Structures are given as structure tokens and as C-alpha cells.
Design a protein around this nucleic acid. Sequence first.
RNA 1: UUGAGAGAUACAAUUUGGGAAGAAAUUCCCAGAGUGUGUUUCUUUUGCGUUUAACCUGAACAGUCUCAUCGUGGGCAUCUUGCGAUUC
Lengths: 227, 143, 51, 254, 70, 60
Amino acid sequence: KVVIEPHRHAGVYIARGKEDLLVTKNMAPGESVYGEKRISVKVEYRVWNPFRSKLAAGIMGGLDELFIAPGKKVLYLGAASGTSVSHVSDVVGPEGVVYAVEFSHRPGRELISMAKKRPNIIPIIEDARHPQKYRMLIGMVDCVFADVAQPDQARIIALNSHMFLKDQGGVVISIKANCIDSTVDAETVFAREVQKLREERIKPLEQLTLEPYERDHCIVVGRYMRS
Amino acid sequence: TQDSNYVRTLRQIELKKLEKGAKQLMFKSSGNHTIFVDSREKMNEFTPEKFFNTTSEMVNRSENRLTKDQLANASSIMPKESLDKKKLKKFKQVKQHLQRETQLKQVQQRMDAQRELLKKGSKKKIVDSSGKISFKWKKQRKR
Amino acid sequence: SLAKSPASTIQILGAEKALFRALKTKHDTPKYGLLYHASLVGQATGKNKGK
Amino acid sequence: SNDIIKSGLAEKALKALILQCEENPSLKNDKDIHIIINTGKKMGINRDNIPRIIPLTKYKLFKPRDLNILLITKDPSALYRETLTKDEHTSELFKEIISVKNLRRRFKGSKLTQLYKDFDLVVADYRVHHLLPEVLGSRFYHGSKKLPYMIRMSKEVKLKRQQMVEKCDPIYVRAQLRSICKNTSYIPNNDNCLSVRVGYIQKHSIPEILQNIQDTINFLTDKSKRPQGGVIKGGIISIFVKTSNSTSLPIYQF
Amino acid sequence: EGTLTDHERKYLNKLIKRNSQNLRSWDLEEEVRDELEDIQQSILKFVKDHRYPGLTPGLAPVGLSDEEDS
Amino acid sequence: IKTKKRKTLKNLRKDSVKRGKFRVQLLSTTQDSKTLPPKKESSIIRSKDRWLNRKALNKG
RNA sequence: UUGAGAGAUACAAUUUGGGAAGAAAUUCCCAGAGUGUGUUUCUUUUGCGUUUAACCUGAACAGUCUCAUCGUGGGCAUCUUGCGAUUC
């Protein structure tokens, strides 16, 4: 037998027993969106993989306030294959809405295929430089997560956050220094990106490097200040 | 060729088992956490217990920092010492899968080097001062 | 997945039992799998079937 | 242990043994003092004729200049013999340095017996120590008075699949030989009885012999110092001080 | 309301401490922590002669007094 | 004396304070980035000056 | 024996915060920080001297013919006792 421990952030649990893992509740029982493990305690939990995805790499690193709650609507930018998007949908439950944006068609097919069975995911196949194109589909959102590996991540987050994000909402960005200068220490690039977000309007709250899960990756969490 | 196929199949088995075990185990995070604070007075008054609103013993735990409001079971399941021993045994099993995989890799590399010596071509024995035996082939194009 | 498989896999697809028992017991591997029922392999005769 | 040292019964036994050795000519022939240790349980280690060195912290039994020493070496004997003769540290240290093949060729039978008469201490390379019983004869090995010790002369470490280079280190050789001469030794057996030489009658005083006995007890009974020490299991029921011909006088009766 | 008494909230602190102990009992042990860290790092990233076993018991101990000129 | 004063000035001008595993970093004032260009990266452009003053150019 | 800066760092006193006990005096536990001294590494500056080296490359193994592989016999137990690896 195993025990389910409620994690600090809502909608996230930890399996306890002979082996310990990070888990989320399953929206569609009896199905796995990819090759992750399922634990039945009844209620079924899918197992997060922090090496595979970067959001609960930040959770395992101990982010303070994730801005992702079961009530909230989340705008996911850079949603390749929907693997992390399924768990974000599990966190926001049936009430919350996750708008998952992806440009490339090859993860686009499987993002559509997973959003077929997951109701609360609204898939968007559209380039993230241009928020005005999918403005019909989005309302206001509580948080914006970014996983794009682009040089102008700060500009993309600026354009999307000015247009869709509410006041006092949250921005959670994953930054890799290799898609930036990459010939200096990664701390320098991270400081540059934090300064860019401050210029844009996002007031940063915290920064967390993702060792041992990713190399030269950080999660920067901040709050949007429209004023 | 049959020998090399056998060792390759064993290495592939061990590599898939290593991948499965690595997915099965969790790893503790060791990463820098920085908090941005607007004022120097709040910097000098920064305490992680009050900021995270959590217990001082739960500060160093990173994966599940529960707040004091949320806090306001080693027995059952399994006794604690044996449970810790079995978790360490799972980690040791994954490490042993890794060691078997790299050992089979080195064996297969040696077999493939000999199987390349068996073929058709002009080769030169190169003896390093360290004593490693290498072979360099002539610049000639395969007909 | 079938596209990402190389040609050597596609030749022996469907003959996994004989393939892996030979690879584990150092014996000769199957020359062919499900593709024995293609029309061209049927027109081939003798040792030319594996070719 | 501490009670065994502080018991006046042991000291009275030591004066009694010394007086009996002085009075009785048969005991006056003997010159060495042995203790007979009754281990509580069986030792469980087969005898292998390999002396194991028991350290003596307080006093030294012998100096290397006092004894007559035979060194038996592996037989490219020129390097070892020439190095030990030429070096001033070990020039006068060894009465004779011989190889095992030359020893086999030269000394046979009665010649071996007069060799045993001549030499008091025998040490050898650990690589030829196992060959020694056939070469030295049985009349060295019976009784354990002059069992050949094991010394390692090159200080190099043998590794698998690689050669071991042959040198001779005179400082290491004289250090090992000094330790052998200043320290007493034991050979394990299967049954409970053990015999350890603790002192020499003429050259040692009674408190010195008692301190050597105490150090021997601590080294053998101590749980650490494995595998040279820690061989006694179940404690010591009784110790018996005696010479070669004298009867056993009991101390530390438990 | 935020108006808990000083005599009050000791029960709250005791409940928080009990829940903290129960949760922290799941985590690990201090002794096994170093071994788990070393094994996780590996995952993520006297004399002996083998010919002559009798050398280890037969060897005489060497000392600084022995390696001295006298 | 002078070293103690320099240490006190450095401690006053320091903007990052570590607290165990965590390290608190000051957010800079918004006025400075508005009123001035960003500060130069010292080593990278010092490479150019070292090259221009290299010893192979006998420069006296 | 050029200065500076940063990190690791043992010990010493000195302090912050959470919680518990205690009437208080205080004590304990947990999480730290700074300072002094000691240890050590890295970075950079300056002085002086060298101021060219490393590596790859052309038809660059081979008459005392070279090499590979499967065998066979022998030496090394006073030990290269020999790994699906290269003991001679």
C-alpha cells in the first residue's frame, strides 16, 4: 500500500511508500497520455517526471507560489506534445482552462490528439510571436507559463502578458542560457533576462536553477504589474 | 558476429532496465534558489521561516514545504529503518544496472574492434607509448 | 514508428521469438518475418528469398 | 588484564620460578620464560608455521646485534646480498645471507643440524617462506623455537597482470628486523592452548616480564588489531608461567 | 479573526509540531542521506599479495622508532 | 583603519545576502536604468585595450 | 616576496529568526548569518623573463618480411599463471 501526501501547491500530491514520486490526479481514469506510471489508491494518480518536464522540476526545486491553482486559467506557451500540459490540466481540474500554444505541426498533431480526450485543454496551433491571431480563443488568464527556447523570450512574454494576462497575475518562465549568449556563465544570462522582464513590466519574485534535472536552466517566477 | 550480437542484446536489455528504474526513482533537487526583495530593510530582515511561512525544520526540505497553516506516519506501511534500507536498495539496483551496461559496452567495443581487424583492407599497427594497441587504415577507397 | 525503424528491423518484423532466441543462444537469425508473404518474396526461390 | 598485572600471585610465581630455575640444574639448563594461555573456546585457525608479531610497547626483548641472524632470499641472490652488504645500515646486521637454492645445495642433514646450532634467528623473504620447510628440514620447524619469520624487502606491491619490480630497501629491512627482535611472536593453533615467550631469564627483570605478559594479554584479547590480534575467543581462563622444563605455575585464575 | 489568546494557540503549535514530525518521518535518515547522495550523483553523472595470503599476518609492524638511526 | 572603512563600504554597497540555501538579491532602483545606459562589461572590452597595448607593439 | 576580489574551509568567541520548557532568570531544539584567526583553490591586475610551442598533414608498418585469426607445444608456483582485452 502507498500513501498520498498533499503537496504545498494545490492539485499536486506526493506518493509515499516503498518508492516515492510526484503525482497528479487523473482526469480520464484508465488512460495514460504518454508512458508515465499510474498508481491507484478509487482514485488514480499519474506520475510526474521532473527530468522530462520543467514545471515540476521547479516544484521539486521548491518554488514558493506557483500561480497555478484549480480555479485558475493558464496560458501555456511552448506546449510541445502536451506532456506537461496534461498535468497542468490535471492541476486546474475540470473547472480551470489551459490554453496550450504550439507552433510546430509534428507536436501539433499529438497535442490535438491529447486535447481530444482532455476537455479543459484548448489547443492552439499558432506562432507565439503574434498574440493577435488567436485573440478570439483567449479571454483573460490568471497565469502565463513559458517554455519556448527562443532568444526573444522576454519579448514574447511581454506581448502575450500585456494582452491576455490580468493585473496581479503570475508569470512563470523557463530560461535556458544556451539559446542566449551561452559563452558566459548562465547566471549572467539569467540576470539579463530578469532585467528584461522588469523592463517589460513583470516584477520578479523568485528565481530557481533546475539542477540536477536540467543544465543551465532556470525558472523565474514574477508578478504582472499593469500599473 | 554471433558473439557481438549476443553482447549487444545484453547491453540493450540492461539499458532499457536502467531507463525504467531511473523513471521509477525520484531524485532530490540541488539548485540555487534566489528571492528578489525590493527593499534593503526587508533584505536585512529576511528570514526563510517567515517568508515561506513554514517550520524551521521544514525549511531545508525543498520538495514539500508545507505552510504553518497547512500543518495546523512512519508507523504502518513498513518500519522506518527497513523502509530506508529498501529505498537505498532501489537506488543501488539502478546503479548496478548502469555498471553492467557500461561493462557490456566496453566488451562490445573490443569485440567490434577485432571484427574490424578481420575484414579486408590495409592496416598499420600503432603502439602507443602508454601501451595501447591501435590500428590505422590506409587512405584507400572501398571499390 | 515504422518509419523511424531501419530496414533491418522491417525485414524481421513479426519473427521476434526466433530472432531473440537466436540472439540469446548464439544461433542463426531469421532471414525474414512478416514480409515473407509479399508477392515478390514468393516469386523468389531458394537462397534468393532472403536476398 | 589490569588485575592480572596487579595481582601479587603472578609476581610471587615469578620469584618462585626464578628460584626453582636457579636451584634445579635441569631447569638451570632452560633460559626462556613462556606463558601458557588457556583460551576459553577453540581458536579455530589452522597452524601454518607463520609467526605473528605481538608488539611490546614498554621494553625490548632483544637487540638485533645480539642474535645470530640467517637471511634466506629469493635467488637472483646477487642484488639482495650485494645491496645489504654494501649498505652501511645492514652491513653488520646479518650473520649470513643465503638464497634458498644455495641453501639447498650447501646444507644437508647434519650440516643443517649444525646450521641450527649456529644460528639463533632465521628470517626470510615471504616469497620463499613456504618453500623453507623442505629446505630447512623438520628439526627447525618442530617446537617453534626458531621458526623463520616473514620479511618483505622490496616495499613494492604486487599487482595482478603486472610484474613486480625487484629492489632492496635496507632501511625497511632493518626496521622489520628491529621489530622482530624487540617484539614477541605467536603461532595460532586449532585447540585452546597457546604458548607465548614473554621474557628471557638473565636479560629481563620481573616487572619487565610482567609488563610484557600484560601487553601480550591486551594485544591478544583486544577486539581490534585484526587479524594479527584478536584471536582469543571466550576470554582467558588461566595463564601458566613456565620455562621449557619447569612445571606450569598458574596466574590469572578465573 | 486573528485574536487568539496567548494561552490559546499552544494547541495549534502542538498540532503543527505533531504533523511536522509525522510528515518528516517519511523523508529519510541522516546516516542514509550521504549514501543516497553519493549513489544519486553516480546515477546522474595494510599490504596484500594476491599470490601469498600469509603476508598480512606474517608482516612485522614498522614504527618510527624502528626507522631511526640509534 | 582604511581597510576597515573599505570593508564597511563594501558591506554597505553589497546587494546580495545569502541565507543558508537561499540567497536574497536586491531589485535595483528603477531610476538608474532610466537615467543611464547600462554599465559596461569590464573584461570583454578590456581585452581590446590589452590588445591595443600589447608588448609586441613597442609602445613607449 | 605583484596587488585586488570571490569561493571552499577548521576553530574560536559573537549574533538573527522559528518553536518548546521555565514564575522569572534562562535553557534546549531547529534554521542561519556576520566577524576574528588558520587552511586552501580560482579569477584578475602588476613586475620580470621566455616570446614561440603544441598538434595535424604530403607516396611515412613491412626481407632480419609485416600483420590478423584459429590451433598446438613449452617457460614463468622463488609467480605478468594470463579479463570472449595483450603472460612470454
